[PDB]
Design a protein around this ligand. Structure first.
Ligand code: SAH
Lengths: 265, 265
């Protein structure tokens, strides 16, 4: 009579925590959603085999509209698990589901897993220096979202780094690349002209974090906008003011132009 | 010829990922550091028994000063694991160690795990709204740091939440409590008088993130400063203006007073 929110991690089925695995193994029913992110190193089949349970995949509408009708009813008389890529409560609105659980008389527990939000530490940028985060959303017909541009401006003025989650259209299997994100940003720059994101802007790209060989690249937009960063998922970062130690790591590990070491004071 | 930075996760020995545990098991030598943070829900012996191989604990000095003389030499002709609490490279000093591995001609890979930085999602506060992070350090002798106070001020001013890592004297296993942090912040407010932290300030406390039963509490400083939040570790968060869903989660899951729905939203 409980509901477990269990994260599966960054890239493959082994990114789940042992705590999460052992609990999932003992649940009666196991649901999951794969629309909030992309696990590029595994398959539903491999996950099912590891957990030894059939996984009932849910759509965004199934969750946001009918979570209390599909999952909670079973949780009232069984041990139920709801799996998600990465950490279940990071860059998702899943936290709200615990409220629905309580109002349904179902106790809930959360089991964390590696998240892209903290995994960006592998870029060498100090985690504490990351400011407000944003999501670069795909334009919808004539609707053109631009809120993320203002987030960068705000952080950059404070000397903070900006983490940019990239859009994903799971049902259409569309995963925004860092290239597409950069293209969108340059266009927003033309409209607002706030001098926030240009060809000379230094950016960092992290692709397939969690894999043994993720792509970690840093450089100016003009040089990376057409570079191949490999298969999705990707995240884009616009650094703020760099510490020499961050610059050194970017140069040594992310192949950044040695000129960034010569930080301006 | 390979060095693995493996995260142990949030609280106990089961917080490591399957990937990390399986890799650690196949390594010829296993090292660990417990100075950037601790693993309050377990012991060295329990971690060692789970992995099944002896673990050599390294001091801060061993790592910061002699990493290349203690760890790297073995990594040259052996597979070596270096375990760290949480997610590797979230702690600011970890990253530079990969550069040392590069110069020694040793390949290094990062195996991620949950970090408190991302685990705070369990407070119901949207991850994108967290601004710059800060650490509350104990004043000592002629040194009385107050930077964390300004971090809250600048974040709150922009409607962002502030995650406050609390001081930890790792070697002595002594943790700063959320209560002590609140007391210190009130003292800083008395000095700076910026109207940033007072008895009417809404705060959130997260203790023992990672365990199935962490303490998640929200309320005004006046009421929480003397409350018992249980055993370490404690994390303090000063939320910025709240989205109604964040407030409802705090009320329903963290026992926050109904007052926050009309004062902090
Ligand atoms: N392994 C990975 N590598 C690079 N980016 C990733 C990633 N996993 C997630 N992302 C990024 O984050 C977006 C999903 S947002 C959901 C994040 C998830 N709850 C977590 O905890 O990580 C993706 O569109 C992508 O931009």
């Amino acid at each position: 009579m409980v509901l477990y929110f269990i994260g599966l991690g960054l890239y493959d089925e082994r990114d789940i925590t042992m705590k999460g695995l052992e609990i999932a193994k003992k649940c009666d029913y196991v649901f999951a959603e794969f629309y909030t992110s992309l696990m590029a190193g595994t398959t539903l089949g491999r996950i099912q085999k590891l957990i030894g349970k059939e996984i009932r995949v849910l759509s965004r509408e199934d969750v946001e509209l009918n979570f209390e009708n599909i999952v909670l009813p079973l949780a009232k008389e069984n041990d139920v698990a709801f799996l998600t890529p990465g950490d279940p409560l990071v860059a998702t609105t899943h936290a709200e589901l615990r409220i629905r659980a309580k109002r349904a008389g179902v106790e809930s527990y959360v089991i964390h897993a590696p998240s892209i939000y903290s995994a960006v530490g592998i870029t060498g940028l100090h985690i504490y220096k990351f400011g407000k985060s944003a999501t670069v959303a795909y334009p919808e017909g004539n609707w053109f979202p631009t809120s993320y541009y203002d987030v960068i401006k705000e952080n950059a003025e404070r000397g903070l780094h900006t983490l940019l989650f990239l859009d994903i259209k799971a049902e259409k299997r569309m995963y925004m690349t860092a290239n597409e994100a950069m293209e969108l940003l340059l266009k927003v720059e033309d409209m607002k002209k706030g001098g926030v994101f240009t060809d000379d802007t230094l950016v960092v790209v992290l692709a397939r974090a969690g894999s043994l060989n993720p792509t970690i690249r840093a450089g100016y937009v003009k040089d990376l906008i057409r570079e191949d960063f490999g298969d999705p998922p990707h995240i884009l970062i616009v650094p703020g003011k760099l510490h020499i130690v961050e610059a050194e790591y970017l140069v040594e590990i992310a192949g950044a132009p040695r000129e960034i070491l010569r930080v301006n004071v």
